[PDB]
Amino acid sequence: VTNSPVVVALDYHNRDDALAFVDKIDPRDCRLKVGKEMFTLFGPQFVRELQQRGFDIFLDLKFHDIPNTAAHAVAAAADLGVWMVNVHASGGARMMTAAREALVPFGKDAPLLIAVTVLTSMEASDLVDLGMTLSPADYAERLAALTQKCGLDGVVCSAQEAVRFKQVFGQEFKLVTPGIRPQGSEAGDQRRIMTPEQALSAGVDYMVIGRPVTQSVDPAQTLKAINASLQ
Amino acid sequence: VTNSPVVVALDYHNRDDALAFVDKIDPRDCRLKVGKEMFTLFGPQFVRELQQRGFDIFLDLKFHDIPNTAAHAVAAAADLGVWMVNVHASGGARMMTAAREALVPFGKDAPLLIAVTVLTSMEASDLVDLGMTLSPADYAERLAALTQKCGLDGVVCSAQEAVRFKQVFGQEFKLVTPGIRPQGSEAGDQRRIMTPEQALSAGVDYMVIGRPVTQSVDPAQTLKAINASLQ
Numbered sequence A, B: 001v002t003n004s005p006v007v008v009a010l011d012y013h014n015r016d017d018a019l020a021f022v023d024k025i026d027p028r029d030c031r032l033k034v035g036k037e038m039f040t041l042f043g044p045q046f047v048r049e050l051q052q053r054g055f056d057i058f059l060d061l062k063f064h065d066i067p068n069t070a071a072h073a074v075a076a077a078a079d080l081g082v083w084m085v086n087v088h089a090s091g092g093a094r095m096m097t098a099a100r101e102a103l104v105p106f107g108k109d110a111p112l113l114i115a116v117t118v119l120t121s122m123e124a125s126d127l128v129d130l131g132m133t134l135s136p137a138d139y140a141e142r143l144a145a146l147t148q149k150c151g152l153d154g155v156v157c158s159a160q161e162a163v164r165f166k167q168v169f170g171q172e173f174k175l176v177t178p179g180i181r182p183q184g185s186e187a188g189d190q191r192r193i194m195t196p197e198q199a200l201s202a203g204v205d206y207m208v209i210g211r212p213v214t215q216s217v218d219p220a221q222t223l224k225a226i227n228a229s230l231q
């Protein structure tokens, strides 16, 4: 077990490149998050390796399918032994409930089930291209509510909602926030940003730091940095 | 190369169970579609096996992330060599365009890039739980349009839209339709259904048959059946 609310997004296009970074750090420092890129490349096999080293993995595949598929997928993750698994709230109540149930069979060994609300890389200007008149914060909340109702453990959103949410949903409903840029840090496709500091402020349970840590010379260092920074 | 517009959804929770079915059939008969369930279990390794046997694989992971992730993911698929790859239209223009571009580097060897519009397992009653006042067919079309604009090759929808679409988008914009129940066939979580026949009618380019073929004694048979049926 670690204490940092930090989950580092391992988004490398090379296994070694990534395993390099991993060896430099240690569980106690943070949790790891494998996602679409790295999973499409090394499958659950790579997840076993990261687990062999003791870390808690967050399989970030944001399942968004028909109820049947969702549930099967979630359980395949529950089989991998992962710490936490992803699902898209935009996929509907039926689907979410389906996922939840698929986990009862694993009970206490079930990973944490969380649903992605609105992606941090979006602004009302993007939701507009879709028949969306609402707004990031607004919309994300509706999804979050539906996610609550279905019995999921938490939701995924920008730290810029971690207050209105933590508010309306309580310290129970866990919040995981990505799009964490620590000042004078390139944003990129990221939008609803915030820094480690102000993030920990809103009350976020965990935060996902991607490039800031991985696209910085001597990343191991930047991690220790960001940690202390959060104390 | 095969001729059937059929892609069988390989959604088995066991590698052998699945490889059994596969050996019974042959490329010429249909194309295979690996998705969340089976991929979360056997990774791209299993995709190589299906390809080793000569079939065309459709990696159905419905990527729905931040633009950066999407593009990286898509390319990881382009590396696997898959025939066709998935992406969620609900993920926005920026994201889609990001994916498209990530493929230019592979040129002629690039898999087909298609975006999922509205999942076949949904009805206006489900879209309602979200701030959606529109309707299946309606909404799916908006997404499809945005997908067209971004330069993607096709879209994924119910065969019950393959006409208004094939209409508004032309024989160019490829259509792939799942939720195919051949009369007196259990629907399940499926909703906007249609039969192989009426599907081929609307003009769908490819169709995804899941359980009808896999949850039927002697499936190999049911495939040959459904094929002839479509002639």
Ligand SMILES: O=c1cc(O)n([C@@H]2O[C@H](COP(=O)(O)O)[C@@H](O)[C@H]2O)c(=O)[nH]1
Pocket (backbone or CB within 6 Å): A009, A011, A035, A060, A116, A118, A119, A120, A121, A156, A157, A178, A179, A180, A190, A208, A209, A210, A211, A212, B065, B066, B069
């Ligand atoms: O809303 C979300 C949900 C995510 O999972 N993510 C993920 O967080 C990761 C890290 O992004 P970054 O390098 O910009 O910190 C990526 O894997 C991305 O897909 C995100 O950026 N926004």
Ligand SMILES: O=c1cc(O)n([C@@H]2O[C@H](COP(=O)(O)O)[C@@H](O)[C@H]2O)c(=O)[nH]1
Pocket (backbone or CB within 6 Å): A065, A066, A069, B009, B011, B035, B060, B116, B118, B119, B120, B121, B156, B157, B178, B179, B180, B190, B208, B209, B210, B211, B212
């Ligand atoms: O809109 C969609 C998109 C899909 O990929 N699918 C997929 O098609 C597959 C087969 O479903 P079925 O067994 O009901 O024919 C599943 O892998 C499912 O996720 C779907 O059912 N509806």
